[PDB]
Design a protein around this ligand. Structure first.
Ligand SMILES: C/C(=C/CNc1ncnc2c1ncn2[C@@H]1O[C@H](CO)[C@@H](O)[C@H]1O)CO
Length: 162
């Protein structure tokens, strides 16, 4: 309608190897996140499929603390060799009134320090949808805290996903 707003929701350099972060955040997150970050993720259930694969749909349920309750993410592309996953949010109440359609790319890049993790969002905006930094700042701050906890978990458990 009005256009597309592409923004980097997270850009995080980490000493942890990219293959381990990729597994933690995009492949095995339905197991890891409710345990390691339960203050951000209540549960993650498969509503289509039973493993992270192209075509599966995961429902992420947020704690009662949260200002919303759930999203459903449909996985559309995986390139594990490049630590890349693209998914589309097809349903949920985490949507601002401004966003008609949301597409996400999780990418992990090998560096010298370790990894660089980028999470990019593509927001298709409704008819004249004003979008402000304040609309994405809580996502940015929440993702950084979640990454912090997951990073520490992988440091404390060096063989997990290794
Ligand atoms: C109202 C409001 C709510 C807060 N939003 C979010 N909080 C946490 N993670 C999010 C969010 N949106 C998209 N993600 C993707 O979740 C995966 C795991 O992190 C990554 O792909 C992230 O890119 C602020 O705008």
């Amino acid at each position: 309608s009005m256009g597309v707003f592409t923004c980097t929701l997270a850009d995080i350099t980490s000493p942890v190897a990219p293959a381990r972060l990729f597994q933690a955040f995009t492949i095995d997150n339905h197991n890891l996140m409710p345990k390691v970050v339960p203050q951000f993720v209540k549960s993650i259930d498969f509503v289509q499929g039973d493993s992270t694969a192209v075509g599966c749909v995961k429902q992420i349920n947020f704690p009662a603390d949260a200002p919303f309750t759930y999203v459903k993410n449909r996985v559309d592309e995986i390139d594990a060799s490049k630590y890349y996953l693209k998914y589309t949010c097809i349903e949920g109440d985490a949507f601002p009134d401004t966003v008609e359609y949301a597409v996400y790319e999780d990418t992990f890049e090998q560096t010298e320090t370790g990894s660089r993790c980028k999470m990019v969002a593509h927001y298709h905006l409704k008819g004249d949808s004003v979008m402000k930094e304040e609309d994405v700042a809580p996502a940015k701050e929440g993702i950084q805290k979640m990454f912090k906890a997951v990073e520490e978990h992988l440091i404390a458990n060096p063989q997990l996903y290794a």
